[PDB]
Design a protein around this ligand. Structure first.
Ligand SMILES: [Mg+2]
Ligand SMILES: [Mg+2]
Ligand SMILES: [Mg+2]
Ligand SMILES: [Mg+2]
Ligand SMILES: [Mg+2]
Ligand SMILES: [Mg+2]
Ligand SMILES: [Mg+2]
Ligand SMILES: [Mg+2]
Ligand SMILES: [Mg+2]
Ligand SMILES: [Mg+2]
Ligand SMILES: [Mg+2]
Ligand SMILES: [Mg+2]
Ligand SMILES: [Mg+2]
Ligand SMILES: [Mg+2]
Ligand SMILES: [Mg+2]
Ligand SMILES: [Mg+2]
Ligand SMILES: [Mg+2]
Ligand SMILES: [Mg+2]
Ligand SMILES: [Mg+2]
Ligand SMILES: [Mg+2]
Ligand SMILES: [Mg+2]
Ligand SMILES: [Mg+2]
Ligand SMILES: [Mg+2]
Ligand SMILES: [Mg+2]
Ligand SMILES: [Mg+2]
Ligand SMILES: [Mg+2]
Ligand SMILES: [Mg+2]
Ligand SMILES: [Mg+2]
Ligand SMILES: [Mg+2]
Ligand SMILES: [Mg+2]
Ligand SMILES: [Mg+2]
Ligand SMILES: [Mg+2]
Ligand SMILES: [Mg+2]
Ligand SMILES: [Mg+2]
Ligand SMILES: [Mg+2]
Ligand SMILES: [Mg+2]
Ligand SMILES: [Mg+2]
Ligand SMILES: [Mg+2]
Ligand SMILES: [Mg+2]
Ligand SMILES: [Mg+2]
Ligand SMILES: [Mg+2]
Ligand SMILES: [Mg+2]
Ligand SMILES: [Mg+2]
Ligand SMILES: [Mg+2]
Ligand SMILES: [Mg+2]
Ligand SMILES: [Mg+2]
Ligand SMILES: [Mg+2]
Ligand SMILES: [Mg+2]
Ligand SMILES: [Mg+2]
Ligand SMILES: [Mg+2]
Ligand SMILES: [Mg+2]
Ligand SMILES: [Mg+2]
Ligand SMILES: [Mg+2]
Ligand SMILES: [Mg+2]
Ligand SMILES: [Mg+2]
Ligand SMILES: [Mg+2]
Ligand SMILES: [Mg+2]
Ligand SMILES: [Mg+2]
Ligand SMILES: [Mg+2]
Ligand SMILES: [Mg+2]
Ligand SMILES: [Mg+2]
Ligand SMILES: [Mg+2]
Ligand SMILES: [Mg+2]
Ligand SMILES: [Mg+2]
Ligand SMILES: [Mg+2]
Ligand SMILES: [Mg+2]
Ligand SMILES: [Mg+2]
Ligand SMILES: [Mg+2]
Ligand SMILES: [Mg+2]
Ligand SMILES: [Mg+2]
Ligand SMILES: [Mg+2]
Ligand SMILES: [Mg+2]
Ligand SMILES: [Mg+2]
Ligand SMILES: [Mg+2]
Ligand SMILES: [Mg+2]
Ligand SMILES: [Mg+2]
Ligand SMILES: [Mg+2]
Ligand SMILES: [Mg+2]
Ligand SMILES: [Mg+2]
Ligand SMILES: [Mg+2]
Ligand SMILES: [Mg+2]
Ligand SMILES: [Mg+2]
Ligand SMILES: [Mg+2]
Ligand SMILES: [Mg+2]
Ligand SMILES: [Mg+2]
Ligand SMILES: [Mg+2]
Ligand SMILES: [Mg+2]
Ligand SMILES: [Mg+2]
Ligand SMILES: [Mg+2]
Ligand SMILES: [Mg+2]
Ligand SMILES: [Mg+2]
Ligand SMILES: [Mg+2]
Ligand SMILES: [Mg+2]
Ligand SMILES: [Mg+2]
Ligand SMILES: [Mg+2]
Ligand SMILES: [Mg+2]
Ligand SMILES: [Mg+2]
Ligand SMILES: [Mg+2]
Ligand SMILES: [Mg+2]
Ligand SMILES: [Mg+2]
Ligand SMILES: [Mg+2]
Ligand SMILES: [Mg+2]
Length: 257
RNA sequence: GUUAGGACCCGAAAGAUGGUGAACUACGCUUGAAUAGGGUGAAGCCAGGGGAAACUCUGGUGGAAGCUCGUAGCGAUACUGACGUGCAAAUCGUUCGUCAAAUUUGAGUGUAGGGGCGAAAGACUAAUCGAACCAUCUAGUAGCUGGUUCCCUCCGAAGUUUC
RNA sequence: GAGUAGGAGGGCGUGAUCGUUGCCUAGAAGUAUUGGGCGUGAGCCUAUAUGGAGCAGCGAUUAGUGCAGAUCUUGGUGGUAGUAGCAAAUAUUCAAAUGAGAACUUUGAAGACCGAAGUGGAGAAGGGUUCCAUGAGAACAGCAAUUGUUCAUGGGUUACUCGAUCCUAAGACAUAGGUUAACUCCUUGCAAUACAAGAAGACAUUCGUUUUCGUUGUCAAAAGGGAAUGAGGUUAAUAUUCCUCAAGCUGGACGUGGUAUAGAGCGGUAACGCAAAGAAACCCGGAGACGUCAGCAGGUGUCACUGGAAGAGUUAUCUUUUCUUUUUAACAUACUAUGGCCAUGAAAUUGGAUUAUCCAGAGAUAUCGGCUGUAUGUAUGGCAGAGCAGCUCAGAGCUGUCAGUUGCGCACCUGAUGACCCUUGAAAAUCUGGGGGAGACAUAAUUUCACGCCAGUUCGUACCCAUAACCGCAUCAGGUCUCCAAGGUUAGCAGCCUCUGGUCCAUAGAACAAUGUAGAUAAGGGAAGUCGGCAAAUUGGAUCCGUAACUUCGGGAUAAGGAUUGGCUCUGAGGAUCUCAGAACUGAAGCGGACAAAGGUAAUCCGACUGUUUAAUAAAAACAAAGCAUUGUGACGGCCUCAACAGGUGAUGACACAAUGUGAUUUCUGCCCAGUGCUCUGAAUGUCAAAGUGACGCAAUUCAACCAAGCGCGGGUAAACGGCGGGAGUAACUAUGACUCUCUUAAGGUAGCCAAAUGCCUCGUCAUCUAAUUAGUGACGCGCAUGAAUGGAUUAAUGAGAUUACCACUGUCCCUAUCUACUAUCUAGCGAACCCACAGCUAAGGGAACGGGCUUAGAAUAAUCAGCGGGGAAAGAAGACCCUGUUGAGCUUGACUCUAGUCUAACUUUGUGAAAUGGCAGUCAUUUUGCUUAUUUCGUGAAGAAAAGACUGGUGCAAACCAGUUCUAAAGUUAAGGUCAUUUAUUGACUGAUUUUUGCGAAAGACAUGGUUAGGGGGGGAGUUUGUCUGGGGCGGAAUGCCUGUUAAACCAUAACGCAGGCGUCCUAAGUGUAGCUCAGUGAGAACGGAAAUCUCACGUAGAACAAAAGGGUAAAAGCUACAUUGAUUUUGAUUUUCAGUAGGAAUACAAACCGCGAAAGCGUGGCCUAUCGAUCCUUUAACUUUACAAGUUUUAAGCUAGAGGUGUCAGAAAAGUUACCACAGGGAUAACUGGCUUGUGGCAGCCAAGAGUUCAUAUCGACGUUGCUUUUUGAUCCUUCGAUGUCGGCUCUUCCUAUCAUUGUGAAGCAGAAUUCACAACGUGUCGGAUUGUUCACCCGCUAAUAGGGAACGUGAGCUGGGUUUAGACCGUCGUGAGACAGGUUAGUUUUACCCUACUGAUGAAACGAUGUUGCGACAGUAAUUUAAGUUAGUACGAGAGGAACACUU
């Protein structure tokens, strides 16, 4: 009657607790200054650094505070091509250039974007991953709706007034180089909550996991588990609509269209 | 003499309640320490021959890798060696795996019992683990094993019936 | 006159209580008795001795009242036994001294060890006084002790600069807020799930006053950050602390000098410079502040060498010799230092530059150029006065401590670089700098200059840090984190040897047997040893040669293989202002001379690789992994956590996170969606709850209708679980095999691939390898049971992974020998433990079927010592196997019951406008559309919300729009300016910077969310169950409830998983009655007519029929036919069978009825008789002046009697698996081994004689039959062993059997010789070497006189071995949904104890008829030699020939 690893990941005292010591700051947008809603504020890239858990570089941006003498530092998401010492413009009137931040409604159809906002003033939500971009599909005439195409490829309607970064998230392509050694995988996952290495549920004894069968090593019970499966029940491919790999009758994706 | 109770006395593998442990050991984390001398020879760089250049061949230079021989360290293959009322409740001799990483290691700090923690052996969790340890309910129940303490005299069995 | 289990009657002995009678310092109780007595016996009385204060009898009362046991409790003691033993870590020895005593103490003299990876010098953790001195009886320091880590007594731990204290980290905890019955719990640095929380200044100097800026805590580092100290000297024990001398730091407070200014240093073109050169808010910096690795450069320390001086060692010989000292702290001043800058000038015939990179018109190179940064550098101060080394004097004194050189040497540090990351390598306190210039100030004000004055608190500072101060019950061969490191050899921090420093501590002496532990070496052969090359052996460095297949082109690779290596004397080449190569000579042809240091090759299987794993039996083929693939999720979300409020991932956002699977590359990925699952924006009414609705009722209720999810229906889905046959036919000897048809609700083994680590048969078949191969490899494949990410086929590198050859190699073997050390031995000293009913010689016998004890025989002499492994069915542990238990636990599910998260519906939280519609007399039901204030979500240093307006500019008709901040890693703050007063000052007031507004901002909005109910779902989780009998259990079967005939033996009764069978129904007639008839069958006879249809007669004891099995019963019937009728009915009770003489099932006889049939008697309470069946509680029904308990009427609800609904395990529980991860109580009531009975089966013998032997039964055999024997087969049984008799085989060794293989002497023959066969006396002696296999067996290759068969607990595990078998890891196949399982393969997997008694082998040995020698006798015990060959016989006898002997003699 043991507790699977599946379950042990929701414990906050637990072993799976993110390794946060390296985190520089949250990467978000500027605060929603009056300046940004009605005008433009400009800042500098003091630097673009590497946060230890992030694929995408972070940009360190100096802004002058509208209301005081203080100089405000903030950390944005690197838009590919942004240079250290660049001028970055955020707001209503800010024009279209790589790394500037406008409302989506002001961004032309077909344009590529970063760090979009789900609700206005998110300081960012969508397409933050290294190399990711969101695609601008359409605007309503009113100006209040915008159709975005997310990396996953699902289309989404967002209030047009939302903040977006012109361009693509930096450091793209990393996902493409094969990792040859296991050690690499190790160091990588060292800076995030530990997912590694992964022991197959069949290796284990019936006590450690629904799968581990026994004398043979098989699942022996259907591995498509229903969405309502209880905590320790939910193990295989959950709520899966299809299972196999589609080879051969691929013309079906087309003919079905 | 029936029966209830500690119920002639001693005896479980178990249950439940409420506590205590991560000084061993398992996995994080912060912050320190540590690993002779060799072999090999990648990019990158120089020159010589050929070429108009691209590039080619020969010779250097350079110093890569979860590469290699091999100490210390970390480990544990074999003799099925020694010892087996030990030096020792896991040691000793030879031998052996690995030896700049998924390496070794100190402290501090996160995880506690149907819970942790696990490169998964039902492994580890203070000589305790296919459910720790401490006390209590608890003299737990025992159709089962063992014991059941002075004398003489007299009567004297059953192992079949039924449920 | 017996007696276990058991019961009764009397009695003995012990406390204490109420009585009664007494005894005791003139000696109570208790205790010892080879004193004297009493009881059959419990027990008693006395005597003597001891003892030194209480006792005793009798009658009752009461009881913690009697012990040999319980592996019983606690305590005390034996034998073993002066035994096992005190043997790791190389070592000690001599003299003196001290002491009662010295192998073990102290000095000296010798010999060795650790050998700067220490047995050295110091720390952290841990210890806590173990430190120092003096003293010392016992104990302890496993011998000893004069000695101590021990005992006693005293004494030791000084700090501004070391550390703690401060800072921040991983973290953590308050406060606030919220949750809990409560305890508890949730949040908080990016600080909050919080928030009216703060700090500073000045005057005041309290308050107060006043001003300024402001959201809010703390703890966690004796290795991280971190203000400043050094050298010398001193104590018995402390010292970067005390003393002496010399320094630095921070905080104070003034003094004296000096900088700067009427606003605030001076020099240089410039980098920049110089003791000093005004300041607040405010904002920004620098240092602190950082990874790993590789090479280069420099410095420190060390090491080496050179001249000088002092000392010491050597001096027969040689040595201008060999060793030693020859030092310089922090700190002060000045200079130099791997880089970077500034000029001037610009570079192409491009240059510069590093070992490496790399730089330049984005200005390189270069200038008698210049500036700047870092010392663990130089000089001087310190400083020689100290320290060190010498030499004098009797505490004082003198001399010298000097001047050079080099290093790929070594350790550390620094400097400039380079390489690396799907890694990118803290923070804060602290010190300091910049931008800004609001304030302050004339007798003034302010200022990082000198020199002087004052202070630095609290705690830790001893000592060990380990083969004796820690943890391992210890002075334990284990374990436990760091720093410093010398010479020689050398690649080397290796090994070996040394110097500094340390140490000889491990009880000792002597002998030198067996056996052992460790170390070596073996002629000839070379794995023949063995499950196996286990173990050992070989190989090994460096230089030169030479180097295959295979391959992922990296590799393979020291592949394989072949040579060389010393010494000495010369020669040449590489460099600054230590490497490399040649030649010659010389030796026992040796020379990596010690040390160090791979054995190869060819195949097969796994896993791709580095990595991981079962602390203490598994290191692997298991896990991991990179790659492949699949699922889920766009945040109103996924996965998980959570008692609650709530939370984590998330400082996140698809190149992301959460679930699985497969397992590098290469190649391939067949066909099945019927099932189980999962899924869907499909259809729809089949099914379905609470609430709400409708109808009946003064009502409770009941009845109806509607109704979410889920179910069912339909679609999708196999890199989801999983599946990939059975039958028939066709071609037709079958099989396998081809096609076809067919059946199950899918499909019907596609590519591939094997007797595979997955084929039973199996030692498959053929090749190959060998002399011989159940082994290896390659092939074939009627694949028991191969097959595609439940992955299939491949595969280089690779491995303490499985297997087979071969080469080298060898003590594995033939075959065993010898040598060393430590033991065993003996001695001084010291000194346990296991175990122990009582004990210990056997033979048989019987016996609980292997006695030590008993019967009968053999027989039997003290006490000892070293050995041993036969016996004590020896020790170990209340069997881990097996069964039993109404005993468990781990795990599983399609077991029973339930259960958290979850899905769905209702009511509620719940507001308000409007519209549309229906009903009601403004309200209500329904639909639609709003609003926002409840509610929810997310933000924000709750600034620019919503609505209006304005300056400038531009576009511009108003309107509206655009701009007043887009080349440029800068600056933008205590403000200007206008208007109006005071006051003449950044004074006062407005404006500069519009207005209004009882929403900080945004997103949802009565939705969601929360609360309670209702229906789904739920091995994630809880609880529990998972019959019995049984020739062990299981699988099977029911001898589980019933009936008949047999076993059963003439009343009844009687066992077995004993025989042969039958029951859980069937029947409105097959019950009941009346009447009539006589059936089965046989002979003879009648159109179609036939063996058989109907019709006749005669005869028919019953041979037919009677639902069902059997047995019995029946002839004007019980049978056949016809008709009538419900007695298959109403009351009770009794009787018989089984029997507890309970129930239940059956049936019988009565008494009351009400009937049917018959004229009537009569017969009917079911079937001719013997089987056909079912309690308590509950429900339902029938019949009844039973009750609802103040009184009533209802409705409803309870009752009494009796049926039906049922328990088949049938006297009647609601109940699935797995465990090899396992557990407990027991069981020899019961399996697995030996032994016992049996002997079918196995084996071995006979009797008869049909036959075979050409002729002839019995030379040699023996059919059909038949009598036996044996216990090396197997079976059967269950007697002994379940608080354990160690369960296969081989090795080793001994003995016995004879059913004789050989050898000896013979008989017989279908015996010529030779060979062979049968038989007798007979084991006396012998019965071998290898292939394959764990093997017993089997089969082959061989030699041989022969290669006999057996026994001894299937001889022989405190004798080995451990291959097989049978725990725990893991692979395949088959089975199961699963956990798991195989009576199927694979692979890894512990083998303990002897010192006792006996036994045997050896060895001493007391004592009688006096002692003691020498020489003998010999009882008895044991015995030992067995074969073969050659010559000769002899080419002989015999024989047609082929062929072919023997005795004697000799070796
Ligand atoms: Mg916590
Ligand atoms: Mg990839
Ligand atoms: Mg499970
Ligand atoms: Mg298994
Ligand atoms: Mg598998
Ligand atoms: Mg599998
Ligand atoms: Mg009584
Ligand atoms: Mg009683
Ligand atoms: Mg208990
Ligand atoms: Mg508890
Ligand atoms: Mg710890
Ligand atoms: Mg070691
Ligand atoms: Mg050995
Ligand atoms: Mg070892
Ligand atoms: Mg019983
Ligand atoms: Mg008493
Ligand atoms: Mg007296
Ligand atoms: Mg008396
Ligand atoms: Mg006396
Ligand atoms: Mg009495
Ligand atoms: Mg007693
Ligand atoms: Mg006793
Ligand atoms: Mg004793
Ligand atoms: Mg010993
Ligand atoms: Mg020592
Ligand atoms: Mg030491
Ligand atoms: Mg010391
Ligand atoms: Mg913190
Ligand atoms: Mg916290
Ligand atoms: Mg300091
Ligand atoms: Mg001082
Ligand atoms: Mg001062
Ligand atoms: Mg660096
Ligand atoms: Mg000299
Ligand atoms: Mg310079
Ligand atoms: Mg002097
Ligand atoms: Mg150097
Ligand atoms: Mg070091
Ligand atoms: Mg960096
Ligand atoms: Mg300034
Ligand atoms: Mg020790
Ligand atoms: Mg000795
Ligand atoms: Mg030899
Ligand atoms: Mg040979
Ligand atoms: Mg030889
Ligand atoms: Mg070996
Ligand atoms: Mg090569
Ligand atoms: Mg070679
Ligand atoms: Mg090879
Ligand atoms: Mg030579
Ligand atoms: Mg030469
Ligand atoms: Mg020579
Ligand atoms: Mg040699
Ligand atoms: Mg080999
Ligand atoms: Mg491997
Ligand atoms: Mg691990
Ligand atoms: Mg381990
Ligand atoms: Mg996906
Ligand atoms: Mg899969
Ligand atoms: Mg497939
Ligand atoms: Mg309803
Ligand atoms: Mg077909
Ligand atoms: Mg084979
Ligand atoms: Mg062989
Ligand atoms: Mg073969
Ligand atoms: Mg290998
Ligand atoms: Mg002697
Ligand atoms: Mg002795
Ligand atoms: Mg007998
Ligand atoms: Mg006997
Ligand atoms: Mg006798
Ligand atoms: Mg014995
Ligand atoms: Mg014994
Ligand atoms: Mg169970
Ligand atoms: Mg429910
Ligand atoms: Mg369960
Ligand atoms: Mg029967
Ligand atoms: Mg009977
Ligand atoms: Mg039957
Ligand atoms: Mg009649
Ligand atoms: Mg009966
Ligand atoms: Mg009658
Ligand atoms: Mg009934
Ligand atoms: Mg027979
Ligand atoms: Mg016969
Ligand atoms: Mg038996
Ligand atoms: Mg035993
Ligand atoms: Mg025995
Ligand atoms: Mg005979
Ligand atoms: Mg015969
Ligand atoms: Mg052999
Ligand atoms: Mg045996
Ligand atoms: Mg096993
Ligand atoms: Mg299966
Ligand atoms: Mg098996
Ligand atoms: Mg003993
Ligand atoms: Mg003897
Ligand atoms: Mg005489
Ligand atoms: Mg004599
Ligand atoms: Mg004599
Ligand atoms: Mg004799
Ligand atoms: Mg002869």
């Amino acid at each position: 009657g043991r507790v699977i690893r599946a379950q042990r990941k929701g414990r906050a005292n637990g072993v799976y607790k993110s390794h946060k010591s390296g985190r520089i700051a949250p990467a978000q947008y500027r605060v929603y200054d009056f300046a940004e809603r009605q005008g433009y504020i400009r800042g500098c890239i003091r630097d673009i650094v590497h946060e230890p858990g992030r694929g995408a570089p972070l940009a360190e941006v100096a802004f002058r505070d509208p209301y005081r003498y203080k100089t405000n530092k903030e950390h944005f998401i690197a838009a590919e091509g942004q240079y250290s010492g660049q001028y970055v413009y955020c707001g209503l009137k800010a024009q279209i250039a790589v790394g500037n931040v406008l409302p989506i409604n002001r961004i032309p159809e077909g344009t590529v974007v970063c760090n979009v906002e789900e609700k206005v003033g998110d300081r960012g939500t969508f397409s933050r991953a290294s190399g990711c971009y969101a695609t601008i599909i359409g605007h309503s005439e009113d100006g209040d709706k915008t159709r975005i195409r997310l990396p996953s490829g699902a289309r989404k309607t967002i209030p047009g007034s939302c903040r977006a970064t012109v361009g693509i998230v930096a450091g793209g392509g990393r996902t493409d180089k094969p990792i040859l050694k296991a050690g690499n995988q190790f160091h990588k996952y060292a800076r995030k909550r530990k997912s590694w290495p992964r022991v197959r549920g069949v290796a284990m004894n019936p006590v450690d996991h629904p799968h581990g069968g026994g004398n043979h090593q098989h699942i022996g019970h259907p591995a498509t588990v229903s969405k309502w499966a209880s905590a320790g029940q939910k193990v295989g491919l959950r709520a899966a609509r299809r299972t196999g790999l589609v080879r051969g009758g691929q013309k079906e994706k087309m003919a079905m269209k």
